[PDB]
Each structure stands twice: as structure tokens, then as C-alpha cells.
Design a protein around this motif. Structure first.
Motif, PDB file in Angstrom:
ATOM      1  N   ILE A 263       0.849  -1.180   0.000  1.00 16.54           N
ATOM      2  CA  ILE A 263       0.000   0.000   0.000  1.00 16.54           C
ATOM      3  C   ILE A 263       0.890   1.238   0.000  1.00 16.54           C
ATOM      4  CG2 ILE A 263      -1.638   1.325   1.395  1.00 16.54           C
ATOM      5  CD1 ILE A 263      -2.934  -1.282   2.203  1.00 16.54           C
ATOM      6  N   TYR A 264       0.609   2.153  -0.935  1.00 13.22           N
ATOM      7  CA  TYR A 264       1.252   3.455  -1.031  1.00 13.22           C
ATOM      8  C   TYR A 264       0.151   4.497  -1.175  1.00 13.22           C
ATOM      9  CZ  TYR A 264       5.101   0.300  -2.327  1.00 13.22           C
ATOM     10  OH  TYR A 264       5.987  -0.748  -2.345  1.00 13.22           O
ATOM     11  N   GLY A 265       0.026   5.399  -0.191  1.00 14.73           N
ATOM     12  CA  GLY A 265      -1.111   6.301  -0.126  1.00 14.73           C
ATOM     13  C   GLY A 265      -2.412   5.504  -0.187  1.00 14.73           C
ATOM     14  N   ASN A 266      -3.235   5.819  -1.207  1.00 10.71           N
ATOM     15  CA  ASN A 266      -4.546   5.243  -1.432  1.00 10.71           C
ATOM     16  C   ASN A 266      -4.523   4.188  -2.543  1.00 10.71           C
ATOM     17  OD1 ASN A 266      -7.276   5.357  -0.438  1.00 10.71           O
ATOM     18  ND2 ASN A 266      -7.848   6.243  -2.428  1.00 10.71           N
ATOM     19  N   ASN A 267      -3.371   3.540  -2.748  1.00  8.67           N
ATOM     20  CA  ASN A 267      -3.144   2.578  -3.814  1.00  8.67           C
ATOM     21  C   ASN A 267      -2.783   1.220  -3.207  1.00  8.67           C
ATOM     22  OD1 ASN A 267      -3.033   4.346  -6.455  1.00  8.67           O
ATOM     23  ND2 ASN A 267      -1.882   5.482  -4.902  1.00  8.67           N
ATOM     24  N   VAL A 268      -3.433   0.143  -3.688  1.00 14.52           N
ATOM     25  CA  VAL A 268      -3.176  -1.226  -3.274  1.00 14.52           C
ATOM     26  C   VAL A 268      -2.618  -1.986  -4.473  1.00 14.52           C
ATOM     27  CG1 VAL A 268      -4.179  -3.361  -2.283  1.00 14.52           C
ATOM     28  CG2 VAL A 268      -5.159  -1.132  -1.715  1.00 14.52           C
ATOM     29  N   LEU A 269      -1.391  -2.497  -4.352  1.00 11.58           N
ATOM     30  CA  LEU A 269      -0.753  -3.261  -5.403  1.00 11.58           C
ATOM     31  C   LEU A 269      -0.618  -4.703  -4.935  1.00 11.58           C
ATOM     32  CD1 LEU A 269       2.139  -0.816  -6.290  1.00 11.58           C
ATOM     33  CD2 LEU A 269      -0.153  -0.825  -7.191  1.00 11.58           C
ATOM     34  N   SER A 270      -0.644  -5.643  -5.886  1.00  9.86           N
ATOM     35  CA  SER A 270      -0.377  -7.042  -5.609  1.00  9.86           C
ATOM     36  C   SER A 270       1.066  -7.205  -5.135  1.00  9.86           C
ATOM     37  CB  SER A 270      -0.629  -7.887  -6.827  1.00  9.86           C
ATOM     38  OG  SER A 270      -1.970  -8.339  -6.829  1.00  9.86           O
ATOM     39  N   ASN A 271       1.282  -8.161  -4.226  1.00  8.28           N
ATOM     40  CA  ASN A 271       2.609  -8.567  -3.793  1.00  8.28           C
ATOM     41  C   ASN A 271       2.714 -10.065  -4.082  1.00  8.28           C
ATOM     42  OD1 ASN A 271       5.021  -9.072  -1.790  1.00  8.28           O
ATOM     43  ND2 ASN A 271       4.681  -6.880  -1.702  1.00  8.28           N
ATOM     44  N   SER A 272       3.904 -10.531  -4.493  1.00  9.80           N
ATOM     45  CA  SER A 272       4.136 -11.946  -4.776  1.00  9.80           C
ATOM     46  C   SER A 272       4.175 -12.789  -3.500  1.00  9.80           C
ATOM     47  CB  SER A 272       5.366 -12.171  -5.604  1.00  9.80           C
ATOM     48  OG  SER A 272       6.450 -11.485  -5.033  1.00  9.80           O
TER      49      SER A 272
ATOM     50  N   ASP B 224      -1.199  -2.490  14.872  1.00 11.18           N
ATOM     51  CA  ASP B 224      -2.448  -2.016  15.452  1.00 11.18           C
ATOM     52  C   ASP B 224      -3.205  -1.124  14.473  1.00 11.18           C
ATOM     53  OD1 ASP B 224      -1.876  -3.331  17.899  1.00 11.18           O
ATOM     54  OD2 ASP B 224      -0.820  -1.539  18.675  1.00 11.18           O
ATOM     55  N   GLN B 225      -2.473  -0.519  13.521  1.00 11.57           N
ATOM     56  CA  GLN B 225      -2.994   0.453  12.566  1.00 11.57           C
ATOM     57  C   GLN B 225      -3.372  -0.265  11.267  1.00 11.57           C
ATOM     58  OE1 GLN B 225      -2.896   3.581  13.442  1.00 11.57           O
ATOM     59  NE2 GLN B 225      -3.564   4.603  11.567  1.00 11.57           N
ATOM     60  N   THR B 226      -4.682  -0.328  10.966  1.00 14.21           N
ATOM     61  CA  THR B 226      -5.191  -0.883   9.714  1.00 14.21           C
ATOM     62  C   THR B 226      -5.364   0.245   8.692  1.00 14.21           C
ATOM     63  OG1 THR B 226      -7.519  -0.737  10.290  1.00 14.21           O
ATOM     64  CG2 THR B 226      -6.379  -2.821  10.883  1.00 14.21           C
ATOM     65  N   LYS B 227      -5.528  -0.126   7.416  1.00 17.74           N
ATOM     66  CA  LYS B 227      -5.724   0.820   6.324  1.00 17.74           C
ATOM     67  C   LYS B 227      -6.859   0.289   5.451  1.00 17.74           C
ATOM     68  CE  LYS B 227      -1.545   2.430   4.593  1.00 17.74           C
ATOM     69  NZ  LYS B 227      -0.150   2.749   4.973  1.00 17.74           N
ATOM     70  N   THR B 228      -7.730   1.196   4.986  1.00 13.42           N
ATOM     71  CA  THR B 228      -8.874   0.898   4.133  1.00 13.42           C
ATOM     72  C   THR B 228      -8.688   1.580   2.774  1.00 13.42           C
ATOM     73  OG1 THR B 228     -10.134   2.575   5.318  1.00 13.42           O
ATOM     74  CG2 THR B 228     -10.512   0.304   5.982  1.00 13.42           C
ATOM     75  N   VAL B 229      -8.813   0.788   1.702  1.00 11.55           N
ATOM     76  CA  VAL B 229      -8.775   1.280   0.331  1.00 11.55           C
ATOM     77  C   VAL B 229      -9.861   0.543  -0.448  1.00 11.55           C
ATOM     78  CG1 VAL B 229      -7.336   1.704  -1.736  1.00 11.55           C
ATOM     79  CG2 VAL B 229      -6.229   1.554   0.516  1.00 11.55           C
ATOM     80  N   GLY B 230     -10.724   1.335  -1.115  1.00 16.74           N
ATOM     81  CA  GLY B 230     -11.887   0.819  -1.817  1.00 16.74           C
ATOM     82  C   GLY B 230     -12.824   0.075  -0.869  1.00 16.74           C
ATOM     83  N   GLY B 231     -12.933   0.598   0.371  1.00 17.86           N
ATOM     84  CA  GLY B 231     -13.812   0.064   1.399  1.00 17.86           C
ATOM     85  C   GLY B 231     -13.411  -1.324   1.905  1.00 17.86           C
ATOM     86  N   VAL B 232     -12.239  -1.813   1.458  1.00 16.96           N
ATOM     87  CA  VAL B 232     -11.628  -3.049   1.947  1.00 16.96           C
ATOM     88  C   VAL B 232     -10.592  -2.687   3.009  1.00 16.96           C
ATOM     89  CG1 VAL B 232     -10.534  -5.253   1.307  1.00 16.96           C
ATOM     90  CG2 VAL B 232     -11.934  -4.014  -0.370  1.00 16.96           C
ATOM     91  N   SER B 233     -10.645  -3.394   4.156  1.00 17.52           N
ATOM     92  CA  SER B 233      -9.715  -3.229   5.262  1.00 17.52           C
ATOM     93  C   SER B 233      -8.540  -4.198   5.089  1.00 17.52           C
ATOM     94  CB  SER B 233     -10.396  -3.451   6.600  1.00 17.52           C
ATOM     95  OG  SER B 233      -9.463  -3.336   7.673  1.00 17.52           O
ATOM     96  N   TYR B 234      -7.325  -3.653   5.311  1.00 15.48           N
ATOM     97  CA  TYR B 234      -6.066  -4.381   5.241  1.00 15.48           C
ATOM     98  C   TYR B 234      -5.326  -4.226   6.574  1.00 15.48           C
ATOM     99  CZ  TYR B 234      -6.876  -4.369   0.111  1.00 15.48           C
ATOM    100  OH  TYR B 234      -7.409  -4.542  -1.134  1.00 15.48           O
ATOM    101  N   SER B 235      -4.669  -5.314   6.997  1.00 21.03           N
ATOM    102  CA  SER B 235      -3.819  -5.356   8.179  1.00 21.03           C
ATOM    103  C   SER B 235      -2.370  -5.566   7.741  1.00 21.03           C
ATOM    104  CB  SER B 235      -4.274  -6.481   9.096  1.00 21.03           C
ATOM    105  OG  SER B 235      -5.591  -6.246   9.584  1.00 21.03           O
ATOM    106  N   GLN B 236      -1.428  -4.827   8.361  1.00 17.56           N
ATOM    107  CA  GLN B 236      -0.003  -4.927   8.044  1.00 17.56           C
ATOM    108  C   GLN B 236       0.644  -5.963   8.957  1.00 17.56           C
ATOM    109  OE1 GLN B 236       3.631  -1.876   6.672  1.00 17.56           O
ATOM    110  NE2 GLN B 236       2.152  -1.211   8.208  1.00 17.56           N
TER     111      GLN B 236
END
Length: 172
Positions: free
Chosen positions: A119-128, A141-153
Motif C-alpha cells: 500500500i502506497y497512499g490510497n493505492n493497493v498493489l499485488s505482492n508476490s 495495530d494500525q489498519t488501512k482501508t482502500v476501496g472500502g476493503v480493510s487491510y492489516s499490516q
């Protein structure tokens, strides 16, 4: 004073300027604990060693003089005492405290394979990078939402690593 053995310690590979004496560490329930080399609850490796004196960097012998640590039950604490002995029998002790906590890791389930993303800013890219079902990771503890989808680091290495790994999974 200066002629006594000096106890050194690293956390996560970095040398520490505060003295080992008085430290409080978290260790996960169920873990194998060696008082000279152990992993804290957040996955950071702690290594304790000694040298002959402040100015003499030659190996000094060090051992646990008192180690009643028992990792079977969370909510208990134990004091560990380490004694370093110089080659002419001068001694330095350090006493640290171990708190037994529950695991800070989470298990990833996903379907056998879990995909990851960067994730870079508001962009979600595939990772291998992929996790297998059952793999255990620290989770920021800090999640990020892009396109209304929640992601955990996440990181399999440490909680610290998880905050900057830029390896994200979909929060379940």
C-alpha cells in the motif's frame, strides 16, 4: 566501578545504552526461555553478554545465578539475576523482570494460501509474497482501508517489523 565485568545487551540486533539491570521484558506464554538469549512477546531477540571491564572488551563469563522463570501461565512475573565473572574473580550482577503475557501473534487462515498486498497512499498493489494457512504473524495495530476493503499490516519477524513491512493481508 570500572574494573568489574560489564554486562552488554542487544535488542533486535541494536546495542542498548540503558543498563540491563532494572529492565522489564514481556515473554509469551509457552515460549522456551533462555535468560541470555530469548525473544520478547513482540518478537524482538534479546541477547545478553559480558566483557572483562569497561575498557577491556575481552569475553567475560556470564550465567543466570537465579532463573525461576516459568512460561506456563500468563499474568505471572519472575526476576532473573545474571552474574558476570571477570578472569580475576570480580563480579557484576544484573536483575531484570520477565512478565508472562499471552501471544501477540495471530494465525492467518484464508483456501490454503493467503495473498499479500503493498500500500502506497490510497493505492493497493499485488505482492508476490504469500502465507500458508496456519502461519503466525505479528499484526500492526494500525489498519488501512482502500476501496472500502480493510487491510492489516503483518510480519512473521516482529511487531515493529509489522508496522513498516508493507506486507498487508485483508483483515478478516
Amino acid at each position: 566501578t570500572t574494573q568489574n565485568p560489564q554486562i552488554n545487551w542487544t535488542k533486535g540486533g541494536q546495542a542498548q545504552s540503558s543498563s540491563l539491570n532494572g529492565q522489564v521484558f514481556q515473554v509469551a506464554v509457552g515460549s522456551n526461555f533462555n535468560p541470555l538469549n530469548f525473544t520478547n512477546s513482540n518478537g524482538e531477540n534479546i541477547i545478553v553478554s559480558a566483557q572483562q571491564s569497561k575498557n577491556n572488551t575481552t569475553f567475560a563469563s556470564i550465567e543466570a545465578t537465579s532463573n525461576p522463570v516459568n512460561t506456563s501461565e500468563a499474568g505471572r512475573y519472575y526476576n532473573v539475576t545474571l552474574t558476570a565473572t571477570g578472569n580475576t574473580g570480580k563480579k557484576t550482577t544484573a536483575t531484570y523482570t520477565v512478565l508472562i503475557t499471552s501471544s501477540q501473534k495471530q494465525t492467518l487462515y484464508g483456501e490454503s494460501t493467503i495473498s499479500t498486498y503493498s500500500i502506497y497512499g490510497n493505492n493497493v498493489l499485488s505482492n508476490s509474497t504469500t502465507f500458508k494457512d496456519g502461519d503466525q504473524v505479528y499484526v500492526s495495530d494500525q489498519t488501512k482501508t482502500v476501496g472500502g476493503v480493510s487491510y492489516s499490516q503483518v510480519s512473521p519477524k516482529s511487531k515493529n517489523d509489522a508496522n513498516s513491512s508493507n506486507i498487508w493481508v485483508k483483515t478478516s
